[PDB]
C-alpha cells in the first residue's frame, strides 16, 4: 500500500491539473465567441443607425 | 500523502471554478462595451450626415 498510495495521489493530481486547465481554456473560448458576436451586433446596429 | 494531495488539488479546483467566472464576466462587460461603442459610432455618423 505504501507504493500505491502515492501512485493514486499522483494520478489524482494529474487529472486535477488537466481538467482545471480545460475549464480555464473553455472560459476564454467562450469569451472569444461572445466578443466576436458582440462585434457582429455592433456592425448590425451601425447599419440601422446610419440608414435612419 | 493522499490527504495532502487531495487538499492541494481541491484549492486549485476552487480557483478553476472562480476564474471560469472571472473570464466570462469580464467578457460580458466587454461584449456590452463593444456594442455600446458602436452606438456612439453610428450616432455620430448619423449626426454628421444630417449636418452635412
Coordinates of N, CA and C in Angstrom, one line a residue:
Chain A
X1 N 0.8 -1.2 0.0 CA 0.0 0.0 0.0 C 0.9 1.3 0.0
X2 N 2.0 1.2 0.7 CA 2.9 2.4 0.7 C 3.2 2.9 -0.6
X3 N 3.2 2.0 -1.7 CA 3.5 2.5 -3.0 C 2.3 3.0 -3.7
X4 N 1.2 2.2 -3.7 CA 0.0 2.5 -4.4 C -0.7 3.8 -3.9
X5 N -0.4 4.1 -2.6 CA -1.0 5.4 -2.1 C -0.4 6.6 -2.8
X6 N 0.9 6.7 -2.9 CA 1.5 7.8 -3.7 C 1.1 7.6 -5.2
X7 N 1.0 6.4 -5.7 CA 0.5 6.2 -7.1 C -0.8 6.9 -7.3
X8 N -1.8 6.6 -6.4 CA -3.1 7.2 -6.6 C -3.1 8.7 -6.3
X9 N -2.3 9.2 -5.4 CA -2.2 10.6 -5.2 C -1.7 11.3 -6.4
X10 N -0.7 10.8 -7.0 CA -0.1 11.4 -8.2 C -1.1 11.4 -9.4
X11 N -1.7 10.2 -9.6 CA -2.6 10.1 -10.7 C -3.9 10.9 -10.5
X12 N -4.2 11.2 -9.3 CA -5.3 12.1 -9.0 C -4.9 13.6 -9.3
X13 N -3.7 14.0 -8.8 CA -3.3 15.3 -9.1 C -3.2 15.6 -10.6
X14 N -2.7 14.6 -11.4 CA -2.7 14.7 -12.8 C -4.0 15.1 -13.4
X15 N -5.0 14.4 -13.1 CA -6.4 14.6 -13.6 C -6.9 16.0 -13.2
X16 N -6.5 16.4 -11.9 CA -6.9 17.8 -11.5 C -6.3 18.8 -12.4
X17 N -4.9 18.7 -12.6 CA -4.2 19.7 -13.4 C -4.8 19.7 -14.8
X18 N -5.2 18.6 -15.3 CA -5.7 18.6 -16.7 C -7.1 19.3 -16.8
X19 N -8.0 18.9 -16.0 CA -9.4 19.4 -16.2 C -9.6 20.8 -15.7
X20 N -8.9 21.2 -14.6 CA -8.9 22.6 -14.3 C -8.5 23.4 -15.4
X21 N -7.4 23.0 -16.1 CA -6.9 23.8 -17.2 C -7.9 23.8 -18.4
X22 N -8.6 22.7 -18.6 CA -9.6 22.8 -19.7 C -10.8 23.7 -19.3
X23 N -11.1 23.8 -18.0 CA -12.0 24.8 -17.5 C -11.6 26.2 -17.9
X24 N -10.4 26.5 -17.6 CA -9.9 27.9 -17.8 C -9.8 28.1 -19.3
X25 N -9.4 27.1 -20.1 CA -9.3 27.3 -21.6 C -10.7 27.5 -22.2
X26 N -11.7 26.7 -21.8 CA -13.0 26.9 -22.3 C -13.6 28.3 -21.9
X27 N -13.2 28.8 -20.7 CA -13.7 30.1 -20.4 C -13.3 31.2 -21.4
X28 N -12.0 31.1 -21.9 CA -11.6 32.0 -22.9 C -12.1 31.8 -24.3
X29 N -12.3 30.5 -24.6 CA -13.0 30.2 -25.9 C -14.4 30.8 -25.9
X30 N -15.1 30.6 -24.8 CA -16.5 31.2 -24.6 C -16.4 32.8 -24.7
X31 N -15.4 33.3 -24.1 CA -15.1 34.8 -24.3 C -15.1 35.1 -25.8
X32 N -14.2 34.4 -26.5 CA -13.9 34.8 -27.9 C -15.3 34.7 -28.7
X33 N -16.0 33.7 -28.5 CA -17.3 33.6 -29.1 C -18.2 34.8 -28.8
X34 N -18.2 35.2 -27.5 CA -19.1 36.2 -27.1 C -18.7 37.6 -27.6
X35 N -17.4 37.8 -27.6 CA -16.8 39.1 -28.1 C -17.0 39.3 -29.6
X36 N -16.8 38.2 -30.3 CA -17.0 38.4 -31.8 C -18.4 38.5 -32.1
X37 N -19.3 37.8 -31.4 CA -20.7 38.0 -31.6 C -21.1 39.5 -31.3
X38 N -20.4 40.1 -30.3 CA -20.6 41.5 -30.0 C -20.1 42.4 -31.1
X39 N -19.0 42.0 -31.8 CA -18.6 42.7 -33.0 C -19.7 42.7 -34.1
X40 N -20.3 41.5 -34.3 CA -21.4 41.4 -35.3 C -22.6 42.3 -34.9
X41 N -23.0 42.2 -33.7 CA -24.1 43.0 -33.2 C -23.8 44.5 -33.4
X42 N -22.6 44.9 -33.1 CA -22.2 46.3 -33.2 C -22.3 46.7 -34.7
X43 N -21.8 46.0 -35.6 CA -21.9 46.4 -37.0 C -23.3 46.4 -37.4
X44 N -24.1 45.4 -37.1 CA -25.5 45.4 -37.5 C -26.3 46.6 -37.0
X45 N -26.0 47.0 -35.7 CA -26.6 48.2 -35.2 C -26.2 49.5 -36.0
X46 N -24.9 49.6 -36.3 CA -24.5 50.8 -37.0 C -25.2 50.8 -38.4
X47 N -25.5 49.7 -39.0 CA -26.1 49.7 -40.3 C -27.5 50.3 -40.2
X48 N -28.2 50.1 -39.1 CA -29.5 50.7 -39.0 C -29.4 52.2 -38.6
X49 N -28.5 52.5 -37.6 CA -28.5 53.9 -37.1 C -28.1 54.8 -38.2
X50 N -27.3 54.3 -39.2 CA -26.9 55.2 -40.3 C -28.0 55.4 -41.3
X51 N -28.7 54.3 -41.6 CA -29.8 54.4 -42.6 C -30.9 55.3 -42.0
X52 N -31.0 55.3 -40.7 CA -32.1 56.2 -40.1 C -31.9 57.7 -40.4
Chain B
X1 N -0.2 11.4 2.8 CA 0.2 11.8 1.4 C -1.1 12.0 0.6
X2 N -2.0 11.1 0.6 CA -3.2 11.2 -0.2 C -4.0 12.4 0.3
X3 N -4.2 12.5 1.6 CA -5.0 13.6 2.2 C -4.4 15.0 1.7
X4 N -3.1 15.1 1.7 CA -2.4 16.4 1.3 C -2.6 16.6 -0.1
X5 N -2.4 15.6 -1.0 CA -2.6 15.8 -2.4 C -4.0 16.2 -2.7
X6 N -5.0 15.6 -2.0 CA -6.4 16.0 -2.3 C -6.7 17.4 -1.9
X7 N -6.2 17.8 -0.7 CA -6.4 19.2 -0.4 C -5.8 20.2 -1.4
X8 N -4.6 19.8 -1.8 CA -3.9 20.7 -2.8 C -4.6 20.8 -4.1
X9 N -5.1 19.7 -4.6 CA -6.0 19.7 -5.8 C -7.3 20.4 -5.6
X10 N -7.8 20.3 -4.4 CA -9.1 20.9 -4.0 C -9.0 22.4 -4.2
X11 N -8.0 23.0 -3.6 CA -7.9 24.5 -3.7 C -7.7 25.0 -5.1
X12 N -6.9 24.2 -5.9 CA -6.8 24.6 -7.3 C -8.1 24.5 -8.0
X13 N -8.9 23.5 -7.7 CA -10.2 23.4 -8.3 C -11.2 24.5 -7.9
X14 N -11.1 25.0 -6.7 CA -11.8 26.2 -6.4 C -11.4 27.4 -7.3
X15 N -10.1 27.5 -7.5 CA -9.6 28.6 -8.3 C -10.1 28.5 -9.8
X16 N -10.1 27.2 -10.3 CA -10.6 27.0 -11.6 C -12.1 27.4 -11.7
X17 N -12.9 27.0 -10.7 CA -14.3 27.4 -10.7 C -14.5 28.9 -10.6
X18 N -13.6 29.6 -9.9 CA -13.8 31.1 -9.8 C -13.3 31.8 -11.1
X19 N -12.2 31.3 -11.7 CA -11.7 32.0 -12.8 C -12.5 31.7 -14.1
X20 N -13.2 30.6 -14.2 CA -14.2 30.4 -15.2 C -15.3 31.5 -15.1
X21 N -15.5 32.0 -13.9 CA -16.4 33.2 -13.8 C -15.7 34.5 -14.2
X22 N -14.4 34.7 -13.7 CA -13.8 36.0 -13.9 C -13.7 36.2 -15.4
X23 N -13.3 35.2 -16.2 CA -13.0 35.4 -17.6 C -14.3 35.8 -18.3
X24 N -15.4 35.1 -18.1 CA -16.6 35.4 -18.9 C -17.3 36.6 -18.4
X25 N -17.2 36.9 -17.1 CA -17.9 38.1 -16.6 C -17.1 39.4 -16.9
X26 N -15.8 39.2 -17.2 CA -15.1 40.3 -17.9 C -15.6 40.4 -19.4
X27 N -15.6 39.2 -20.0 CA -16.0 39.2 -21.4 C -17.4 39.7 -21.6
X28 N -18.3 39.7 -20.6 CA -19.6 40.2 -20.8 C -19.7 41.7 -20.7
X29 N -18.9 42.3 -19.8 CA -18.9 43.8 -19.8 C -18.2 44.2 -21.1
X30 N -17.3 43.4 -21.6 CA -16.7 43.8 -22.9 C -17.6 43.6 -24.1
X31 N -18.4 42.5 -24.0 CA -19.5 42.4 -25.0 C -20.4 43.6 -25.0
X32 N -20.8 44.1 -23.9 CA -21.6 45.3 -23.8 C -20.8 46.5 -24.4
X33 N -19.6 46.7 -23.9 CA -18.9 47.9 -24.4 C -18.7 47.9 -25.9
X34 N -18.4 46.7 -26.5 CA -18.1 46.6 -27.9 C -19.3 47.2 -28.7
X35 N -20.5 46.9 -28.3 CA -21.7 47.4 -29.0 C -22.1 48.8 -28.6
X36 N -21.9 49.1 -27.3 CA -22.3 50.5 -26.9 C -21.3 51.5 -27.4
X37 N -20.1 51.1 -27.8 CA -19.2 51.9 -28.6 C -19.7 52.1 -30.0
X38 N -20.3 51.1 -30.6 CA -20.9 51.2 -31.9 C -22.1 52.1 -31.9
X39 N -22.8 52.1 -30.8 CA -23.9 53.1 -30.7 C -23.4 54.5 -30.9
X40 N -22.3 54.8 -30.2 CA -21.7 56.2 -30.3 C -21.2 56.4 -31.7
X41 N -20.5 55.4 -32.3 CA -20.0 55.5 -33.7 C -21.1 55.9 -34.6
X42 N -22.2 55.1 -34.7 CA -23.3 55.3 -35.6 C -24.1 56.5 -35.3
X43 N -24.2 56.9 -34.0 CA -24.9 58.1 -33.7 C -24.1 59.3 -34.2
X44 N -22.8 59.4 -34.0 CA -22.1 60.5 -34.5 C -22.1 60.5 -36.1
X45 N -22.1 59.3 -36.7 CA -22.1 59.2 -38.1 C -23.5 59.8 -38.6
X46 N -24.6 59.4 -38.0 CA -25.9 59.9 -38.4 C -25.9 61.4 -38.2
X47 N -25.4 61.9 -37.1 CA -25.4 63.4 -36.9 C -24.6 64.1 -37.9
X48 N -23.5 63.5 -38.3 CA -22.6 64.1 -39.3 C -23.3 64.2 -40.7
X49 N -23.9 63.1 -41.1 CA -24.6 63.1 -42.4 C -25.7 64.1 -42.4
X50 N -26.5 64.1 -41.3 CA -27.6 65.1 -41.2 C -27.1 66.5 -41.2
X51 N -26.0 66.8 -40.5 CA -25.5 68.1 -40.5 C -25.0 68.5 -41.9
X52 N -24.4 67.6 -42.7 CA -23.9 67.9 -44.0 C -25.0 68.2 -45.0

